[PDB]
Design an enzyme around this catalytic site. Structure first.
Site: not given
Ligand SMILES: [Mg+2]
Ligand SMILES: [Zn+2]
Ligand SMILES: [Zn+2]
Ligand SMILES: [Zn+2]
Lengths: 119, 64, 52, 134, 263, 45
Positions: C23, D1-4
């Site tokens: 991530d 998005q996705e851990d951000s």
């Protein structure tokens, strides 16, 4: 360190503010690219530009939130223009703005009196 | 160190509104609620004077 | 295919995150630039986010 | 998005999570000898050897910088010298990692024992939030 | 016809209501007011001596946000200076940038508390003068001092818009709420157990319908009537902002026309 | 040579190169350095 220059947000680097260029495909329809000015001017010539029966399409969208610009496509079809459709629009706007710029400068001082004065 | 001046979310000036703030929660027996008497209807910035640490009285006393 | 934005991180495409099982927890990723015009060809015709 | 996360620029402009980054450079004055001196003299491009991409134009007569001089790049802040026509002065002075910038908080010149001089330089470098910070 | 219907006003905010107009224009007015509205603010400090506790870096950022008087602005030559970028003069000149001073010292032994009052313009009734949001105070707080900690600062303001740094917008926020019940259902309220029962009616809700029926809901209907509420910082009177909002919004539409009828 | 300032007193020590690091009308042996003149270019952001 790689922060784009802020002043390069409000100043066209020798970039032609407006650019009018047909498409192809579509026939009798062109695409406008205003630069260093967007997300405000754009939304108007739309939710208002689509109000002219003469119109058959109304583009409008910023390609990337880093480049400070935006395109606008108009199709019409069939007699003119469409450089004239958007101007007939813009004109209808400036004039519709004053409609309120005046009511404001009119009703302001008018409800300024009821809160005492005096003179 | 000292109030932020200008809240983080809006623009509402808060540099002015502290020399007067502190003179209520410890000098007028009014609640944390008293700031409401400073035009703080929004969240917002009003968590600005509230969540603040006076880190200068306790820093200023290191005289060179 | 590079190009080229500002600000100091690598922007990459979300749908490509699964292959890199990682991530944006502040991860780093390495970039290796080819030189010779003969490798530039390999990693274009065989290895490509598309053909992969 | 996705851990951000995406942050408001208006805010970071008024001071959200603005931080400072002090770094400090230690430097003494070794002396072996015999009696080998090594003072913090300002290197003289007349018999040094060797050091380029200065610039030493930012050192005082003292061979040390004065706060708070806008320091950037591989600029230098102290100057050394070690004996060996026109001979002989070396340069064991410490530069400044380019990756850093900003002004100079303050410097403290004291004595060691040892038995020579002993300088410490600290420079501050505001750090604002930028895309890519945690 | 009309177009606006104001309610209450004060000295820092202006509550009112738009009428015959479209959504676009509404928002496009919200935005305008929050960004591109010329103002004065300080954007360059030179430090001489500073032995206080706030670093130079930390002062610049702070001395900046402190609001200043702007009033007319867009009306040169005097009582208004054009952007310092496109100026007929070179580098920086008082003809397009207002000089400010700060010579704070210490004569006490207890503790000092320097406010926005201690600054000094020049005497060119621009202005100019910062502000004093505080009630009979002296202005927003700048820095504290103890023994001998005099600071000497030269400040000069330029002209800029929020876009260029949130420092400029003389506008706090804005508080709109078109369609307070749910005519056009431009929103799907989350229940959780009973809809019109969890979500609070709004103060501005008492100015409309369409409860009862089951009409059923309309659709030829566009969003009109927008309940805005502009609040200024105190840098420039409470509209002002609004007035000067369209003046440089019309002129932003014009730019366009002129770049299409000339050729 | 230049001037230096002590950690406590702060009085002008104006002491000479290559000597002994200390003070004059007091004690302790450290010392920082006067800030340069110096009108320095500082953006407010
Ligand atoms: Mg994990
Ligand atoms: Zn706020
Ligand atoms: Zn000028
Ligand atoms: Zn001493």
């Amino acid at each position: 360190m790689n922060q784009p220059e802020r002043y390069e947000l409000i100043e066209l680097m020798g970039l032609p503010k407006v650019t009018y260029e047909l498409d192809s495909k579509s026939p009798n329809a062109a695409v406008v690219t205003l630069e260093k000015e967007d997300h405000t001017l754009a939304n108007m010539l739309a939710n208002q530009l689509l109000s002219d029966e003469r119109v058959l399409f109304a583009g409008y969208k910023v390609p990337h939130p880093l480049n400070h610009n935006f395109i606008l496509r108009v199709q019409t079809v069939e007699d003119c223009s469409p450089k004239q459709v958007i101007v007939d629009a813009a004109k209808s706007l400036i004039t519709h703005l004053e409609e309120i710029k005046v009511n404001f400068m009119r009703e302001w001082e008018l409800k300024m009196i009821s809160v005492e004065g005096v003179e | 160190m000292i109030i932020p001046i200008r809240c983080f979310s809006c623009g509402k000036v808060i540099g002015d509104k502290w020399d007067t703030y502190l003179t209520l929660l410890q000098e007028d027996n009014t609640e944390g609620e008293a700031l409401d008497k400073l035009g703080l209807q929004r969240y917002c910035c009003r968590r600005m004077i509230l969540t603040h640490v006076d880190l200068i009285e306790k820093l200023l006393c290191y005289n060179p | 295919r590079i190009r080229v934005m500002p600000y100091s991180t690598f922007r990459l495409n979300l749908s490509v995150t699964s292959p890199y099982n990682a991530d944006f927890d502040g991860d780093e990723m390495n970039m290796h630039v080819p030189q010779s015009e003969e490798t530039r060809a390999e990693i274009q015709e065989i290895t490509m986010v598309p053909k992969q | 998005q996705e851990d951000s996360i995406i942050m408001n620029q208006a805010s970071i402009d008024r001071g959200l999570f603005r931080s400072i980054f002090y770094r400090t450079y230690t430097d003494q004055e070794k002396k072996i000898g015999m009696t080998v001196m090594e003072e913090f003299e300002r290197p003289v491009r007349s018999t040094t050897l060797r050091m380029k991409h200065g610039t030493y134009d930012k050192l005082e007569d003292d061979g040390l910088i004065a706060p708070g001089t806008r320091v950037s790049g591989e600029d230098i802040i102290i100057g050394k010298t070690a004996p060996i026509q026109l001979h002989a002065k070396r340069d064991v002075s410490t530069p400044l990692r380019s990756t850093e910038s900003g002004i100079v908080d303050q410097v403290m010149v004291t004595t060691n024992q040892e038995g020579l001089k002993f300088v410490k330089v600290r420079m501050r470098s505001t750090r604002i939030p930028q895309i890519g910070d945690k | 016809e009309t177009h606006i219907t104001i309610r209450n006003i004060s000295k820092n905010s202006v509550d009112f209501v738009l009428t015959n107009t479209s959504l676009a224009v509404a928002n496009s007015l919200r935005r305008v007011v929050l960004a591109e509205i010329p103002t004065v603010a300080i954007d360059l400090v030179e430090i001489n001596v500073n032995t206080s506790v706030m670093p130079d870096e930390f002062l610049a950022h702070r001395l900046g946000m402190i609001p200043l008087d702007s009033s007319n602005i867009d009306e040169p030559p005097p009582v208004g200076l054009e952007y310092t970028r496109n100026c007929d003069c070179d580098q920086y000149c008082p003809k397009c940038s207002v000089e400010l001073f700060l010579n704070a010292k210490c004569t006490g032994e207890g503790t000092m508390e320097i406010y926005a009052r201690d600054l000094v313009v020049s005497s060119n009734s621009s202005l100019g003068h910062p502000i004093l949001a505080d009630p009979k105070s002296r202005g927003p707080l700048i820095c504290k001092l103890r023994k001998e900690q005099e600071i000497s600062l030269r400040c000069i303001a330029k002209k800029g818009i929020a876009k260029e740094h949130a420092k400029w917008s003389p506008t706090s926020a804005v508080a709109f709420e078109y369609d307070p019940w749910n005519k056009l259902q431009h929103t799907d309220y989350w229940f959780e157990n009973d809809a019109d029962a969890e979500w609070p009616k709004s103060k501005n809700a008492d100015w409309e319908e369409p409860p009862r029926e089951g009409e059923p809901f309309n659709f030829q209907e566009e969003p009109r009537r927008f309940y805005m509420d502009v609040e200024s910082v105190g840098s420039i009177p409470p509209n002002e902002i609004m007035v000067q909002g369209l003046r440089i919004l019309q002129e932003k539409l014009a730019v366009l026309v002129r770049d299409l009828d000339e050729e | 040579t230049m001037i230096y300032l002590c950690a406590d007193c702060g009085a002008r020590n104006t002491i000479q190169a290559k000597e002994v690091i200390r003070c004059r009308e007091c004690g302790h042996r450290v010392m920082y350095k006067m800030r340069t003149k110096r009108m320095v270019q500082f953006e407010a952001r």
